[PDB]
Design a protein around this ligand. Structure first.
Ligand code: AZZ
Ligand code: MYR
Ligand code: MYR
Ligand code: MYR
Ligand code: MYR
Ligand code: MYR
Ligand code: MYR
Ligand code: SAL
Ligand code: SAL
Length: 582
């Protein structure tokens, strides 16, 4: 196009254009104030319309990266606020832009964003809506500089609905809060998920990623031919590779381009794309990536014709090991949407191992006639972890269930930070909440998604603050080994029980007047220091105590005179349990 800006403005819309320019500049100039940024958006939007009016207007033919950089090099305090980043302005565009990508801060030092009161929030949102969103949109961006922009916009649009609906309600907070937490968590997960995909692209390699996508894709579009999926795995790989490079616009077009190919090849890909394809440039990619799996053929043979029996298995496999193995994954995944992607790589890594062995045999066929046999236990184990856990969760409530997990893990690795356990057990604990709601069909996949972040997130904390060679192994190991590795952890025997401290176990009436969360976070934080002091406790010697506490509260919060009750009663509880747990 004669004018990069004229185009992006025209098919995004003025509204979407400004939100996107804001986030863009908010991720770079993270230290400037809101008024300052609003400055740019308006300076830029005014310039843009210039270009829409005349594609040949002054400076409209300049590239975005160029225009973007110029504006970046426009800030007066650039050199004294961003220091090095300012040295980027002394470079020619191709490098400049590249220098600006490197001089960005992943984790800045801004304070945590504090959720105001539903009243002041709803008020503010009402008074000056636009600013209310753009500002906090500004606030999210500057804290998550790498978070893909458009997606951040989708959360914005959502957050906006959260208010539109709830602020005009009766028991507002009862409507908004259990939406903000959902939107928060949800965005914290989206942030961790794209941060990992890239972490995966470097440590593990191009091949490994490709393996991943052939599976998730044929699992998604199971009616595509192998060649059609390969095309996509290839186009997709480019995408993540560039997007993981940082450049937003480069990343954006790769995504746009690909979605164009997919929409002009629906008949060749899925039938579930009518909708998504019918949307405007902004939604397509997003929409598609979220579309449901198409239904499979139904007649579909059995993977035994081409991978076990049939002559020339080794002949085919040896000609192009990967294309072959890819064809295994393809054929295997498409007949199993119910499978966790990583479980499919496990099966395939097996089959692989097998051929490298059996195709170097006297009578091959005989050597691997027993291969699909080795798949049942690999499949079973993860399936049976779900049963057991969801069964357990149908039994106890989410909370009562998050405490089983708490004790479970506190005994697995007592060394880990107490606050880290509560959090893990909680986040981990939720997972069963919104996965065990799905029937078998969607479960296992479900878990792999959430469990993947909850685990990486856990590794990172352990990365920065190592604490157990064991979680380092599980965290250092391969993706296919990660999750199972963790389920392998056994109760720690070498552990030496944390010596006692009544302060850690002493409770004041303030608990009576605490927000449920706080109350739970508080019961659980102790339940842990409890397992950490008296680890050799039976869920028997342990289900107790927890009960003498259940009413220990009812006995001091209902009381006319708390304060002291939480002292005289307290001494009695601690004492009763000092002995109970010999
Ligand atoms: C997994 C995932 C990726 N993405 C984006 C972010 C990634 N770039 N970065 N950073 C990009 C990789 O193709 O897709 C997304 O918007 N939502 C998601 O759930
Ligand atoms: C891109 C997101 C735009 C969302 C705008 C946020 C307005 C909501 C107020 C903050 C709510 C969550 C803050 C928090 O949970 O700490
Ligand atoms: C300084 C000017 C900045 C302009 C930024 C324009 C960003 C346009 C993003 C379009 C993203 C489409 C994403 C998609 O289709 O998945
Ligand atoms: C587009 C080419 C398709 C290639 C498919 C390659 C599949 C081979 C990977 C086998 C699984 C073990 C490799 C890994 O560690 O992820
Ligand atoms: C273990 C100290 C950190 C706590 C988490 C360790 C185990 C997390 C693995 C979760 C995977 C399976 C879920 C489960 O089996 O309960
Ligand atoms: C709150 C209870 C949550 C329990 C969820 C456990 C689900 C286990 C998922 C196992 C995934 C295995 C992945 C793999 O083997 O590659
Ligand atoms: C040394 C003995 C200390 C006694 C402290 C017990 C710890 C109690 C944790 C309570 C968990 C209960 C959850 C609930 O009450 O619903
Ligand atoms: O912190 C949030 O509330 C949030 C929301 C959406 C996306 C990323 C986020 O951090
Ligand atoms: O971004 C896409 O275009 C996409 C397409 C298919 C599957 C996952 C995806 O993220």
């Amino acid at each position: 196009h004669k004018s990069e800006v004229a185009h992006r403005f025209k098919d995004l819309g003025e509204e979407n254009f400004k939100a996107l320019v804001l986030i863009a500049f908010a991720q770079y100039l993270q230290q400037c104030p809101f008024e300052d940024h609003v400055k740019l958006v308006n300076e830029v939007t005014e310039f843009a319309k210039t270009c829409v009016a005349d594609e040949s207007a002054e400076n409209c033919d300049k590239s975005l990266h160029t225009l973007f950089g110029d504006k970046l090099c426009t800030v007066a305090t650039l050199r004294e606020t961003y220091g090095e980043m300012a040295d980027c302005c002394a470079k020619q565009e191709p490098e400049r832009n590249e220098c600006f990508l490197q001089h960005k801060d992943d984790n800045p030092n801004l304070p945590r964003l504090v959720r105001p009161e539903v009243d002041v929030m709803c008020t503010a949102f009402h008074d000056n809506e636009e600013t209310f969103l753009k500002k906090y949109l500004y606030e999210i961006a500057r804290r998550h500089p790498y978070f893909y922009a458009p997606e951040l916009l989708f959360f914005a649009k959502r957050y906006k609905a959260a208010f539109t609906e709830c602020c005009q309600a009766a028991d507002k907070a009862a409507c908004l809060l259990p939406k903000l937490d959902e939107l928060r968590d949800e965005g914290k997960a989206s942030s961790a998920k794209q941060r990992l995909k890239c972490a995966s692209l470097q440590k593990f390699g191009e091949r490994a990623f490709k393996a991943w996508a052939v599976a998730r894709l044929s699992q998604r579009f199971p009616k595509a031919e192998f060649a059609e999926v390969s095309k996509l795995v290839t186009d997709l790989t480019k995408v993540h590779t560039e997007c993981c490079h940082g450049d937003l616009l480069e990343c954006a077009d790769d995504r746009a381009d690909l979605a164009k190919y997919i929409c002009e090849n629906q008949d060749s890909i899925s039938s579930k794309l009518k909708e998504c394809c019918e949307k405007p440039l902004l939604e397509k990619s997003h929409c598609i990536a979220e579309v449901e799996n198409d239904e499979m053929p139904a007649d579909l043979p059995s993977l035994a014709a081409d991978f076990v029996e049939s002559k020339d298995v080794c002949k085919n496999y040896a000609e192009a090991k990967d294309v072959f193995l890819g064809m295994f994954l393809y054929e295997y995944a498409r007949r199993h949407p119910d499978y966790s992607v990583v479980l499919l790589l496990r099966l395939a890594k097996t089959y692989e191992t097998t051929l490298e062995k059996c195709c170097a045999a006297a009578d091959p066929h005989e050597c691997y006639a027993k291969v699909f046999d080795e798949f049942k236990p690999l499949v079973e184990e993860p399936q049976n972890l779900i049963k057991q856990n969801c069964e357990l969760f149908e039994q106890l409530g989410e909370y009562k269930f998050q405490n089983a997990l708490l004790v479970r893990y506190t005994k697995k690795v007592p060394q880990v930070s107490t606050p880290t356990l509560v959090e893990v057990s909680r986040n981990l604990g939720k997972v069963g909440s919104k996965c065990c709601k799905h029937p078998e069909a969607k479960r296992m996949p479900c878990a792999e998604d959430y469990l993947s972040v909850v685990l990486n997130q856990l590794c990172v904390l352990h990365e920065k603050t190592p604490v157990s060679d064991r979680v380092t192994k599980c965290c250092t190991e391969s993706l296919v080994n990660r999750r199972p590795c963790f389920s392998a952890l056994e109760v720690d025997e070498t552990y030496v029980p944390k010596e006692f401290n009544a302060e850690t176990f002493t409770f004041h009436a303030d608990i009576c007047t605490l927000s449920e969360k706080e109350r739970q976070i508080k019961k659980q934080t102790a339940l842990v220091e409890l397992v950490k002091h008296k680890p050799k406790a039976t869920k028997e010697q342990l289900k107790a105590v927890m009960d003498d506490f259940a009413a220990f509260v009812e006995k001091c919060c209902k009381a006319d005179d708390k304060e002291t009750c939480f002292a005289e009663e307290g001494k009695k509880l601690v004492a009763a349990s000092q002995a109970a747990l010999g």
